[PDB]
């Protein structure tokens, strides 16, 4: 007559699967070279244009009236977040006690909480040499983002840093399923209403994620700590992205931020 631990990590885990369209084993799959529509690589203005009239067609079928290549890069970048925003909202429904918090509180919990959880996963599709994008239908290289004007080529990189650490801890789906619902989980959010009923939230996430990493990484017996250091990390890269995000919102007119993602920014940080 106890909670089943293990069985709420496998709830967690098969709800990852279910609801995000790219994981660490899909996207390790096509990073490794394995035949039918392989990834088109995007290592160059070129290669940029070739990909994005067969994978984007309609970005670039405007004529002299497409935008800058980096402002399209930008909102290819800002229709990826829309989607795995919507991903993770439907995820969310698998955590205990979610669905059971006020509408306003679960808005609030994936207003902060949705970026950190991005940044996270997105990893999984990133090597030291560049990135799945399109629904793994591109790789797009580290060094061309690098290379594209200011301030667009100050986004990606950040992510690139956090993400070849992380990598090296070796987690797999199982223990990234948990650390994103363990995010979403946070009591300290600003604006919380029933941050008692979340903090026993975060609190019963948290005990299931510490014990599937005692138990799948019995080689590594800080990885507990060492992911909630991560949390943090991830919070301050969020906080530093939406910085970005707001000079290129002043000082770039045509990069439109998408509606959905601007309420997520405001009044965030
Ligand atoms: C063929 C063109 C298609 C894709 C290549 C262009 C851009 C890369 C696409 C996605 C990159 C992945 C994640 C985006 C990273 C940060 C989010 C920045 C926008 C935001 O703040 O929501």
Do not use: W
């Amino acid at each position: 007559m106890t909670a089943d631990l293990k069985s709420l990590a496998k709830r967690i885990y098969e709800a990852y699967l279910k609801n995000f369209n790219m994981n660490k084993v899909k996207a390790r799959v096509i990073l490794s070279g394995k035949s039918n529509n392989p990834p088109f690589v995007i290592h160059d203005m070129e290669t940029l244009c070739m990909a994005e009239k067969t994978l984007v067609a309609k970005l670039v079928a405007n004529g002299i009236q497409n935008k800058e290549a980096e402002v399209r890069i930008f909102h290819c970048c800002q229709c990826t977040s829309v989607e795995t925003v919507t991903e993770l909202t439907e995820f969310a429904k698998a955590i205990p006690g979610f669905a059971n918090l006020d509408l306003n509180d679960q808005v609030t919990l994936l207003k902060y909480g949705v970026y950190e959880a991005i940044f996270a996963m997105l990893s999984s599709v990133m090597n030291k040499d560049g990135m799945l994008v399109a629904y793994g239908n591109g790789f797009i290289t580290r060094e061309f983002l690098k290379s594209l004007r200011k301030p667009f080529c100050d986004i990606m990189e950040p992510k690139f840093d956090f993400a070849m650490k992380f990598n090296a801890l070796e987690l797999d789906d199982s223990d990234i399923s948990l650390f994103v619902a363990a995010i979403i989980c946070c009591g300290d959010r600003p604006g919380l209403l029933n941050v008692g009923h979340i903090e026993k939230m975060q609190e019963g996430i948290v005990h299931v994620l510490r014990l599937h990493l005692q138990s799948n990484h019995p080689d590594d017996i800080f990885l507990f700590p060492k992911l909630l250091q991560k949390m943090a990390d991830l919070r301050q890269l969020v906080t530093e992205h939406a910085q970005l995000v707001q000079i290129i919102k002043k000082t770039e007119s045509d990069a439109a931020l998408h509606p959905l993602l601007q309420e997520i920014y405001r009044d965030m940080y």
